[PDB]
Amino acid sequence: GSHMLEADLELERAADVRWEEQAEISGSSPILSISIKNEEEEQTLGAELEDGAYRIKQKGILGYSQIGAGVYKEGTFHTMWHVTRGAVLMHKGKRIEPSWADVKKDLISYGGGWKLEGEWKEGEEVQVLALEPGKNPRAVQTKPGLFKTNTGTIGAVSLDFSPGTSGSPIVDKKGKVVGLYGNGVVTRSGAYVSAIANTEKS
């Protein structure tokens, strides 16, 4: 084999994980990314990992491509299984390795088990803190729908962002992460929706 990584996947911090008051008022609001940053350039990249929402960027010969996003909380990085498929990640020269995954929930954690402790019950609204390829972070408030699964129930939001937003946090009014964007599941009625982890009852 090779002792090199098969892919260069780099993390880039983009936003604090918080409920945004402006998005509760207006339905959406831009969030600060920092010098204040006026434009995201996807192709460039930007005891040293802290809490927040990050982009995941894969190096190629044409530059970086944003393949997804995730959340650092309590020493653990959280993202979607489909985004990394267990590949090692880098942040500013530090390597982080997979620790836990659940392919059915489309989840994977690095550097510990799951730490995200947001909650949601029927009728509450959440904010998608979306890190889309090419865009500065934006908070968009939305009301999840409730769904029966073949083992209990789950909430979902509509798939209303780029696929490369997968792994961005969905926050409750306490600022805690109910789930991550981009776990696409099929409804009996034909629709694709984005299922929210933590909301699952089984």
> Annotated active-site positions, please?
82, 106, 166
In angstroms, the CA 152 to CA 201 distance is: 5
Sequence-distant (6+) residues with CB within 8 A of 33 are 14, 15, 40, 136, 137
- Count of Cβ atoms closer than 10 Å to residue 12 Cβ: 19
CB 147 within 8 A of CB 184: no
Q: Which position has the token pair 């190629």? A: 60
For residue 72, give the amino acid letter: Y
Q: Which helix (H) or strand (E) holds 3?
A: none
* Structure determined by: X-ray
What dihedral do alpha carbons 160, 165, 166, 169 form, nearest 10°? -90
Strands (E), the chain: 9-15, 28-30, 52-60, 63-73, 76-80, 89-91, 94-96, 98-102, 107-110, 126-130, 138-142, 145-148, 153-157, 169-171, 177-180, 184-186, 192-195
| Residues 10 and 91 sit within 8 Å (Cβ to Cβ) | yes
Extract the tokens encoding 113.
């088990």
3-class DSSP state of 94 = strand
CA 70 vs. chain centroid, Å, equals: 4
Question: What resolution (Å)?
Answer: 1.5
Instruction: Decide: helix, strand or coil at residue 167.
Output: coil
Block residue for tokens 């498929």: 85
Facing residues of 147 across strands? 154
**Pair of tokens at residue 142:** 């939305």
Q: How far apart are CA 55 and CA 45, in angstroms?
A: 9
3-state secondary structure 40-88: CCCCCCCCCCCCEEEEEEEEECCEEEEEEEEEEECCEEEEEHHHHCCCC
- 103 in helix, strand or coil? helix
What ranges in the chain are assigned the alpha helix state H? 21-26, 81-84
